[PDB]
């Protein structure tokens, strides 16, 4: 549990697969995988002491675009969950508000735009 290299590899496995033996070592990893790996690490460390508003900020997007982006992404998740439900596939648990992190989330960098969840709905 306290092994940094092992825990880092597991959390970052989704990015490494998307932007790909497997080059998980820091010296071997190159390209977008390096940039996305470094950003994820720094965000993880910052979350402990930095204020929630300042540490994470969604990139500015117009409303008609972001609501469209969220709607299409939600439809993709529903199809992914329904298809697994119709089959026997077991899926990782997700909290109620949060969006499930499908493969498209990592490749398309959707989270930086739409965010993990709708903060307004979480607040109420």
């Amino acid at each position: 549990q306290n092994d940094l290299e092992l825990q880092q590899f597991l959390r970052e496995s989704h990015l490494l697969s998307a932007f790909n033996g497997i080059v998980y070592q820091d010296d071997q990893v190159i390209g977008k995988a390096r940039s996305r790996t470094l950003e994820m690490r720094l965000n993880r460390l910052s979350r402990v002491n930095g204020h929630q508003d300042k540490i994470n900020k969604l990139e500015k997007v117009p409303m008609h675009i972001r609501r469209g982006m969220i709607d299409k992404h939600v439809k993709r998740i529903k199809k992914y969950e329904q298809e697994a439900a119709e089959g026997g596939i077991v899926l990782s648990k997700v909290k109620k508000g949060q969006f499930r992190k499908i493969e498209s989330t990592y490749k398309k960098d959707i989270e930086r735009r739409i965010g993990g969840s709708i903060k307004a709905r979480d607040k109420e």
């Binding site: 820091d26 010296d27 071997q28 990893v29 190159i30 390209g31 977008k32 390096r34 940039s35």
Partner: protein
């Protein structure tokens, strides 16, 4: 930047680019590699034009 940080090739080329740009005068300092993005600007190149350097040397008002 996307090359691994300990790569000998990455460090060599980044220093060479810093070496060259400082010599031209586009870059004021050689210390920080991030300057290649933040402090590389058209104004930096324009600031080395002959009329501007005359102004800074006080050859013209």
């Amino acid at each position: 930047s996307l090359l691994p940080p300990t790569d000998p090739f990455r460090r060599k080329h980044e220093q060479l680019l810093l070496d060259k740009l400082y010599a031209m005068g586009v870059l004021t300092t050689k210390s920080k590699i991030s300057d290649l993005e933040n402090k590389v600007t058209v104004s930096a190149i324009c600031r080395r034009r002959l009329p501007v350097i005359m102004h800074r040397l006080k050859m013209a008002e």
